């Protein structure tokens, strides 16, 4: 009594059944240097990008959709400005990515669900369940997909509006009492898993939300509710955006829980990655602490080591963590290039502290080296796509020349 | 043509309407009817007070046989014995025709220029269906406003929506008048201008009528005025009337329109007032919970279309309560819109016109309009360099006032010199001075001569080598 | 005495300038923010009781 065509339907509020859940242990390569280096994400993990009223929260999503290493993408727009869709459906058919040859269209790999801030309110909720059911479907075919949700706080606003319309007790700032349960049951659909069926294939879903708190505070009930359930978090700063410093991530408040489970991948490929990451984070934190006093003491009682620490921190914040968005050279920094730049910066700082360790004055070294700082600051221009071994040799010889110069310039 | 002759043939029809002399209460600005015989949600009625003065209303809820009507022109004087309603069997519609240009209408869209009625070509609902996103195209153009701070550091592409945040007492009116008087495509001044002012004093209306008259622009414009003493409820209709007129003009006669909304703060206040009359759940600071959607359905009506040539550009003027960018109204206005120009109080106290600071202002579609084929190839990053140097000047000056003038390296001295000149010569300009983008960029380069080439890092070396020496 | 007095006056004036310029306004802004938050909570409590 059953006839099956080439298609079938499915209720949207019932997650599709799966054989068993597994642990995601393969990194998701974004392309952005800061995200890959300090706050990595894993293929099958969640994330938040709390906006701060126009701080380039679309650049991150744009890059993620353009260059992520996923077999499919499902870009969802809930409460979108409406103009953006007109740009994302014009750029893609004019851009290409290569996987088994250069296939000119990227649109062949993407579907879009659009619900602008103008269209009816009640359809905001039904724009994310529809968005994620397709992602689950494509997972069932053993493909690594990734859903890039737009503002999820607008969904909460729609929930509040309808709740108030019916008439019922609000919990916080009007939001209904059951907000905390709607979100969790949505984020819980993410993650790697083994599909249900005979041929024994595997897939994954990796959602990346983006909340839009009122004002700029992270006390919004929407914000404080996702941070309780997510696994990665990427704050955003306003002044950094106002200075044209993109990406505008706040490196002192963001964090990532998928920092150790990637040890297997690093050992397979890049054994010394985590050590360099920790050392750089320590450098930045120390620089922040040291600068915390210069604002009211003046840079008078600063030893040579502190001055070098501040100089290195400024160098890093100006070169390493600025991706300059779109260009021909720094648009998608591969993992190896980021690793080599990381090692070069750490080696520069180490040698600078070594030479001054023996009493040699750093002030003279400042202009005695001269070319070392320019070399490290211009290393970011090395053109990718020129060969993994191509720039590998250049970065190999760069640090050798640097340490030879330091030994010679030790005078 | 036949298609024209059939769209209106349905007009030749007569449909009588009922009169209900049955009211069953009044409360606040609301009125409750009874035994209404198939109400319709969002209808229009015509109250006829016992005095003989007509008013107008709009249903908001309909139960089995009750209709709750809110009245525009207040509710006082109404009686439950002699009043009389009359259901028009329709929503609210505006009579439009391309002869509206050069006339004046009040808050309710009826002439106040001692002229005749509109003698329309068709009636249009003040609301409008959203635009199919698949049928929208992004600007790829640029408007030369003649203001260096607006035409170099930011940019305006026709089809874009840009607010103007300004405190109370600052000359945002003068800036808007200058922009509308002095705007053209970068190599037209044929921008038909619809203008809607809500919650303004008599002096502002007189000033705006004066400025449009001496510049020879009053023959291609259309003004909707809703002064401060007019009924409060009508302030909600006015922007919808103005935008409906603009949409008709642009998308059905192929002409480029530019729209001004004089005071969105008054609109927000009216929304809050009407909401509090009912018992809707409030958002932060008391504003309604759904204000975001209501603002969105006003702003998101600009842009271009695939099969048409018209394009309507918005310049809503908004006033912050206490110079607080974290207030709900600016927050939602800048979440919905794409960029916004900021008028600064601090620069105003020093007699700098236009008192525009550049740090807190943004223009989303700048990166597309600028480039090559329309301006010089340096425009893309000279703005970034100026941004960085201005930001450095700000904190250098801030540091000078704490530690004194002992720890200011040469970098800080150059930054302070740049900060002083960048405000005293570049931002400032006259109230009748044009500035083509070429001249503005030349002046901008002149201000980077202070810095030696070796530390202008944000800028590209190629541009430096070809322009830094000329 | 000249040298010592110069040093002492310099340090004290520097400290006074720092306190005046980058301490008081920060605390004032914090106080204003907290004051606003308290009323924000009061409004919600009032609304619940009204319902």
Curated annotation (Swiss-Prot), chain B:
Domain of life: Eukaryota
Any one biological process term the GO annotation gives: proteasome storage granule assembly
Protein family: Belongs to the ATPase alpha/beta chains family.
Modified residues annotated as Phosphoserine in this record: 129
SUBUNIT field: V-ATPase is a heteromultimeric enzyme composed of a peripheral catalytic V1 complex (components A to H) attached to an integral membrane V0 proton pore complex (components: a, c, c', c'', d, e, f and VOA1). Interacts with RAV1 and RAV2 components of the RAVE complex, which are essential for the stability and assembly of V-ATPase.
Glycyl lysine isopeptide (Lys-Gly) (interchain with G-Cter in ubiquitin) crosslink location in chain: 6
Protein encoded by which gene: VMA2
Intracellular or extracellular location(s): Vacuole membrane
Residue positions binding ATP: 364
Entry keyword S-adenosyl-L-methionine: no
Keywords from the UniProt entry: ATP-binding, Hydrogen ion transport, Ion transport, Isopeptide bond, Membrane, Nucleotide-binding, Phosphoprotein, Transport, Ubl conjugation, Vacuole
Name of the molecule in the record: V-type proton ATPase subunit B
Main subcellular location: membrane
Any one Gene Ontology cellular component term annotated for this protein: membrane raft
InterPro entries, alphabetized: ATP-synt_VA_C (IPR055190), ATPase_a/bsu_AS (IPR020003), ATPase_F1/V1/A1_a/bsu_N (IPR004100), ATPase_F1/V1/A1_a/bsu_nucl-bd (IPR000194), ATPase_V1-cplx_bsu (IPR005723), P-loop_NTPase (IPR027417), V-ATPase_su_B/beta (IPR022879)
PANTHER family: V-TYPE PROTON ATPASE SUBUNIT B
Organism ancestry: Eukaryota, Fungi, Dikarya, Ascomycota, Saccharomycotina
Membrane topology annotation: Peripheral membrane protein
General function of this protein: Non-catalytic subunit of the V1 complex of vacuolar(H+)-ATPase (V-ATPase), a multisubunit enzyme composed of a peripheral complex (V1) that hydrolyzes ATP and a membrane integral complex (V0) that translocates protons. V-ATPase is responsible for acidifying and maintaining the pH of intracellular compartments.
GO terms of molecular function: ATP binding; proton-transporting ATPase activity, rotational mechanism
Other known facts: Present with 131000 molecules/cell in log phase SD medium.
UniProtKB/Swiss-Prot annotation, chain C:
Functional summary from the UniProt entry: Subunit of the V1 complex of vacuolar(H+)-ATPase (V-ATPase), a multisubunit enzyme composed of a peripheral complex (V1) that hydrolyzes ATP and a membrane integral complex (V0) that translocates protons. V-ATPase is responsible for acidifying and maintaining the pH of intracellular compartments.
Assembly behavior: V-ATPase is a heteromultimeric enzyme composed of a peripheral catalytic V1 complex (components A to H) attached to an integral membrane V0 proton pore complex (components: a, c, c', c'', d, e, f and VOA1). Interacts with RAV1 and RAV2 components of the RAVE complex, which are essential for the stability and assembly of V-ATPase.
Provenance organism: Saccharomyces cerevisiae (strain ATCC 204508 / S288c) (Baker's yeast)
Domain of life: Eukaryota
Gene coding for it: VMA8
Species classification: Eukaryota, Fungi, Dikarya, Ascomycota, Saccharomycotina
Similarity annotation: Belongs to the V-ATPase D subunit family.
Location relative to the cell: Vacuole membrane
Record-given protein name: V-type proton ATPase subunit D
Note: Present with 8500 molecules/cell in log phase SD medium.
